[PDB]
Amino acid sequence: HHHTDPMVSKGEELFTGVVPILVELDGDVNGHKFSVSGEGEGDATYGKLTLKFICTTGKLPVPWPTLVTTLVLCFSRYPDHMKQHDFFKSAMPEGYVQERTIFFKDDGNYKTRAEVKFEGDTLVNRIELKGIDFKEDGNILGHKLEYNYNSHNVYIMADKQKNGIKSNFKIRHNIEDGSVQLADHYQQNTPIGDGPVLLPDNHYLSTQSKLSKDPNEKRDHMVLLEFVTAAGIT
Numbered sequence: 001h002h003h004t005d006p007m008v009s010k011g012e013e014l015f016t017g018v019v020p021i022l023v024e025l026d027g028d029v030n031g032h033k034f035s036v037s038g039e040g041e042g043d044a045t046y047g048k049l050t051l052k053f054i055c056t057t058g059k060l061p062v063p064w065p066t067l068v069t070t071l072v073l074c075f076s077r078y079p080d081h082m083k084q085h086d087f088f089k090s091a092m093p094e095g096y097v098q099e100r101t102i103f104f105k106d107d108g109n110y111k112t113r114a115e116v117k118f119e120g121d122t123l124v125n126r127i128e129l130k131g132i133d134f135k136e137d138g139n140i141l142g143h144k145l146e147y148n149y150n151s152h153n154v155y156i157m158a159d160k161q162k163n164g165i166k167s168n169f170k171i172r173h174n175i176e177d178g179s180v181q182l183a184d185h186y187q188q189n190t191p192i193g194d195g196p197v198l199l200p201d202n203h204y205l206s207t208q209s210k211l212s213k214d215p216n217e218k219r220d221h222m223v224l225l226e227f228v229t230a231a232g233i234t
Contacts, residue, residue, distance in 0.1 A: 001016070003080075003083060005083075005084060007090065007196070007198065008083045008084060008086075008090075008198075010090075011086060011089035011090045011092060011198075012083065012089065014089065014092050014093060014118070015042075015044035015045075015074065015075070015089055015092075016045075017043070017045075018041050018042070018043050019041065019042045019043075019044075019075075019121070019122075019123050020039075020040075020041055020121065020122045020123070021038070021039065021040050021041060021042050021049070021051060021072060021122070021123050021124075021125070022037075022038070022039060022119075022122055022123070022124045022125070023036070023037065023038035023039075023051065023053065023071050023072075023124075023125045023127070024036075024037060024038075024124070024125070024126045024127065025037075025038075025067070025070065025071060025127040025128075025129060026127070026128050026129070027128075027129040027130075027131070028129070028130055028131065029061055029062055029108075029110075029129070029130075029131030029132075029134060029141075030108070030131060030132065030133075030134050030136075030141065032061035033057065034055060034057045034058075034060060034061055035055070035056045035057050036053050036054065036055050036056065036060070036067070036071065037053070037054050037056050038051045038052060038053035038054070038071055039051065039052060040052055040224075042072065042074075042075035042123065043075070044074070044075045044076065044077060044089070045077065046077060046227070047075065047076055047077030047227050047228045047229045048075070048225075048226070048227055049072065049075050049224065049225070049226040049227075049228075050224070050225055050226075051071070051223075051224045051226075052214065052221060052222070052223050052224070053067075053071060053221060053222045053223075053224065054217075054219050054220070054221045055219065055220040055221070056219075058220070059220050060220050061141070062131070062140050062141065062143075063140065063143050063144075063145040063147075063173075064147065064211065064222040065145050065146075065147065065148070065149055065173055065211065066104075066110075066140060066145065066173065066183065067129075067222075068149055068209055068211075068224065069100070069102070069171060069183075069185060070100070070102075070110065070112050070114070070127060070129060071125070071127070071224075072116060072123060072125050073088045073098075073205065073228065074088035074089050074091075074092060074116065074123070075228065076088065076205055076228040076229065076230055077228065077229045077230065078230040079229075079230065079231075081233065082203065082230050082231075082233050084198055084200075085198065085200035085201055085203055085230070085233065086198060086200070086230070087156075087158075087164070087165050087189065087197055087198050087199065087200050088189075090196075090197045090198040091189075091191045091192070091193065091197050092117070092118060093117065093118040094117060094191070094192045094193030094195070095115055095116050095117025095118070095191075095192045095193070096115075096116055096117075096164075096189050096190060096191050096192055097113065097114065097115055097116075097189065097190050097191075097192060098112075098113075098114045098116060098187065098188075098189050099112065099113050099114075099187070099188050099189075100112045100185055100186060100187045100188075101185075101186050102183050102184070102185050102186075103183070103184040104134075104138075104139075104140055104181060104182070104183050105181065105182040105183075105184070106135075106138070107133075107134055107135055107138045107139065107140055107181075108131055108132055108133040108134030108135070108138075108140065109131065109132065109133060110129055110130070110131045111129070111130045111131075111132075112127055112128065112129045112130075113127070113128050114126060114127040114128075115192065117192060139173075139175055139181045140181075144175050144176050144177075145173050145174065145175060145176070145181060146173075146174040146175065146176055147211055148174060148211060149209040149210070149211055150171075150172055150174070151206070151207060151208040151209075152169070152171060152206075152207050153204045153205065153206050153207070153231075154167055154169045154204060154205050154207065155167060155168075155169065155202065155203075155204050156200060156202070156203055156204065156205060157200075157202050158199040158200055158201070158202075159188065160199060162188070162190050163190065163191060163197060163199070164188060164189050164190035164191065164197075164199075165188070165189045165199075165200065166187065166188050166189075167185070167186075167187045168184075168185065168186050168187070169184075169185050169187075170182055170183065170184055170185070171183040171185060201233065202232075203230055203231065203232040203233050204230070204231055204232040205228050205229065205230055205231075206228070206229045206230075206231055207226065207227065207228045208226070208227045209224060209225070209226045209227075210224070210225045210226075211223070211224060212224075212225070
């Protein structure tokens with residue numbers, strides 16, 4: 001609402017209230033083609049997301065928790081003293097590309113590319129996902145993961161050469177038998193536009209996610225509440 005840096009003001013202004021979100025994913029995992037649509041709202045003031053996702057092609061062929069990181073970090077809450085480090089909002093409204101490779105230990109990998117940008121007043125995240133080399137009897141295609149999600153801190157670093165950011169981090173998915181399925185993420189983000197962006201000092205994001213079901217919904221779906229806060233600069 002009041003920042004002495006006009007570049008920060010420009011990005012904050014687009015995220016000042018509740019912003020509607022649309023998520024589209026087209027996926028192919030070991031030749032099972034599927035699509036997911038999601039709708040909800042983001043409130044960057046509190047770092048809060050609320051989304052509901054539907055598999056529009058029938059039953060989702062992989063477990064919903066494996067898609068949480070893939071299915072909008074511009075809604076992170078950056079403390080006032082860290083707002084000059086917020087790459088994600090500084091790239092708006094033209095947006096950014098978010099690319100990942102996700103390696104599931106002892107199993108296959110996801111390769112994702114997403115464009116995150118405004119269409120009018122709506123923040124859209126449009127994703128293509130390709131998954132290969134998964135085991136039919138593994139934890140992913142065998143749906144052995146529990147329907148829950150662990151809190152996680154992720155380290156963000158600038159990539160000055162690409163005018164973007166980079167991160168590598170591990171997600172632990174609980175398996176029904178009490179064990180864990182590791183998912184190693186590599187991520188890079190680059191701006192879509194050619195204007196300047198804020199390139200951050202090293203810092204981390206703290207995330208927490210809660211998964212639930214809509215008791216009146218017959219389609220395969222996931223309801224997601226996420227909180228993300230930046231930290232690590234004193």
